[PDB]
Design a protein around this ligand. Structure first.
Ligand code: NAG
Ligand code: CA
Length: 364
């Protein structure tokens, strides 16, 4: 069914069974403290995004989640449930990273692979038109075109990133869908030197895709730890005047809007409840210590440019291994402020889940 306006209005957000199963089968059996067990049970009910970060998730997880939401809705959920999905499988993924877990390469049929993936997602979303579906498009993609064009892999991938982003925006432009393109975070694109070039890029992409109706705007702070709004700059932010997501968005939106894209925002707060964090530097993104579960997902943001506070990166799923000998080891995961020992990316990291619970704000 179609919708008008903020896609988070008029619906409840579904808490998916993948994250719920992680908490109940992997986390809780390792927790003996009664209060931490009850807190863990509560966090399993908080609705976070489900990531299509490997092709095999499309005909498994996506179908299962949509099917379960349809069942719940037909069983009288009121308001009806909506889905929250991340599209995250560009070829030559994460072009500026030390290592990437992306499965596809431009040199090994990756363009065709990606187009087919988007096409299959489109078929499934059409099947499940009755389930309003909110998408984050490709974290750690186009932000690289703003600041990392000096990196050979990024320069070589840029036309592909742009073309395939446009492809997804047009193919997924369906009446029951909303899309938010990833736009980095305050400590990446929010630096004053980067903010106008970033606005130029995202507004051009939006134009070149034909300003698809389903595109609501941009997502920020995905898989990062930034504050929404704090009174004092965390020490690792200096001297960026845009030291939280509110400052970033308030500076960013006017530049985007003058360029034709009056973007609304969603802001990840799933690991933002403790401020400042235990990061020693802003660019230390992997399994950062001293972080907490943050404000609960809601459409009631109170801010004119923010459609929702969300939990995009699910807390407890590892950002990368601390094993320096692993094939896809990223040195960020070995830093002094990265919790260790850490399993492979995507594996449940229970010590990190417990950290998030202990530092949760609001508490569980
Ligand atoms: C991706 O998964 C689909 C099924 O959803 C399958 O048909 C296709 O072959 C897979 N892609 C690749 C490149 O293996
Ligand atoms: Ca510093």
């Amino acid at each position: 069914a179609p919708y008008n306006g903020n896609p988070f209005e008029g619906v409840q957000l579904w808490a998916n069974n993948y994250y719920r199963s992680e908490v109940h089968t992997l986390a809780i059996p390792q927790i003996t403290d009664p209060a931490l067990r009850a807190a863990a049970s509560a966090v399993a009910e908080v609705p976070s995004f489900q990531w299509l970060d490997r092709n095999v998730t499309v005909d498994t997880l996506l179908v299962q989640t949509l099917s379960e939401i349809r069942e719940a809705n037909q069983a009288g959920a009121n308001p009806q449930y909506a889905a929250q999905i991340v599209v995250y499988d560009l070829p030559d993924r994460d072009c500026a990273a030390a290592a990437s877990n992306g499965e596809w390469a431009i040199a090994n049929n990756g363009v065709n692979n990606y187009k087919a993936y988007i096409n299959r997602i489109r078929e499934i979303l059409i099947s499940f038109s009755d389930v309003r579906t909110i998408l984050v498009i490709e974290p750690d993609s186009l932000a690289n075109m703003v600041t990392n064009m000096n990196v050979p892999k990024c320069s070589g991938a840029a036309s592909t990133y742009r073309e395939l982003t446009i492809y997804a925006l047009k193919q997924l432009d369906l009446p029951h869908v909303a899309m938010y393109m990833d736009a980095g975070h305050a400590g990446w694109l929010g630096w004053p030197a980067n903010i106008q070039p970033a606005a130029e890029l995202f507004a051009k992409i939006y134009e070149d895709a034909g300003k698809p109706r389903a595109v609501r705007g941009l997502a920020t702070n995905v898989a990062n730890y930034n504050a929404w709004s704090v009174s004092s700059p965390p020490p690792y932010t200096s001297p960026n005047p845009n030291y939280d997501e509110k400052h970033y968005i308030e500076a960013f939106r006017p530049l985007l809007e003058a360029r034709g894209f009056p973007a609304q925002f969603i802001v990840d707060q799933g690991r933002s409840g403790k401020q400042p964090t235990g990061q020693k530097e802003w660019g230390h993104w992997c399994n950062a210590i001293g972080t907490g579960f943050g404000m609960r997902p809601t459409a009631n943001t109170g801010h004119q440019y923010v459609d929702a506070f969300v939990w995009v990166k699910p807390g407890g799923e590892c950002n990368g291994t601390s094993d320096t000998t692993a094939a896809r080891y990223d040195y960020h995961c070995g830093l002094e402020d990265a919790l260790k020992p850490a399993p492979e990316a995507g594996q449940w990291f229970n010590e990190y889940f417990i950290q998030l619970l202990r530092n949760a704000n609001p508490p569980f």
